[PDB]
């Protein structure tokens, strides 16, 4: 319906987004000064403290926005929130697939630091849109409470 294509480009990796028409320029602003946050793009996957994959494009973006939601600019209060909720949706949608951020972050660039980077970026937009964690237990604690595993602390 009210839809406006948005791209996230860096080196070899880009992402496709579908914004409400109203919210398309609020998300253009972030996308813009956010690609300035990024350094000189490598067409490889090695620049340290910079995106390796497309799961990091969204992760690094989600946090970029949540910083300006919670902090500073009061001119764009409702617009930040909408921009957030959409990215958090597109994320839990494609990238997370209804699984935890950790097990999904655990599958990115071999660089240990970056995998943590994805996780803090999510719980940054998770809290900045007020979304509480939903009460799931893990496959571990299921089979734990079902006496397949015998967990100790």
């Amino acid at each position: 319906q009210s839809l406006r294509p948005l791209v996230l480009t860096h080196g070899s990796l880009e992402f496709s987004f579908l914004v409400p028409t109203s919210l398309h320029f609020q998300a253009a602003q972030l996308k813009d000064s956010f690609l300035a946050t990024l350094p000189q793009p490598t067409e490889e996957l090695a620049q340290d403290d910079e995106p390796s994959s497309v799961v990091e494009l969204v992760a690094r973006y989600i946090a970029f926005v949540a910083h300006e939601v919670d902090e500073g600019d009061e001119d764009a209060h409702p617009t930040n929130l909408e921009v957030l909720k959409l990215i958090l949706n597109e994320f839990e949608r494609a990238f997370m697939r209804g699984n935890d951020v950790h097990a999904i972050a655990a599958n990115v660039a071999g660089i240990t630091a970056k995998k943590i980077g994805v996780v803090r970026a999510y719980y940054a937009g998770r809290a900045a849109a007020g979304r509480a964690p939903k009460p799931y237990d893990s496959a571990l604690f299921r089979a734990a409470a079902e006496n397949n595993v015998k967990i100790y602390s």
Partner: protein, 76 residues
């Protein structure tokens, strides 16, 4: 690490093996009712997990080797 306490999906939990379990000796019988000790070795080879090792002087002659094989055992 951390992600294994929160992993949602199936077969997300792994169990550290037991050597007694994983690699424990066993017994099995055939359709023609032989009985083998059930080990990785015997199963691999297709014969008892007792084996006469290669030994130059004594394990060279083609007799003793063929004989020890006709006895249904692993020799070198």
């Amino acid at each position: 690490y951390k992600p294994e306490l929160f992993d949602r999906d199936d077969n997300a939990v792994q169990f550290a093996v037991d050597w007694v379990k994983e690699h424990g000796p066993r017994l099995v019988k055939t359709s023609v009712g032989q009985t083998f000790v059930d080990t990785k070795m015997s199963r691999l080879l297709g014969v008892p997990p007792v084996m006469v090792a290669g030994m130059t002087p004594t394990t060279v002659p083609w007799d003793f080797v063929a004989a020890t094989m006709n006895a249904g055992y692993h020799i070198e």
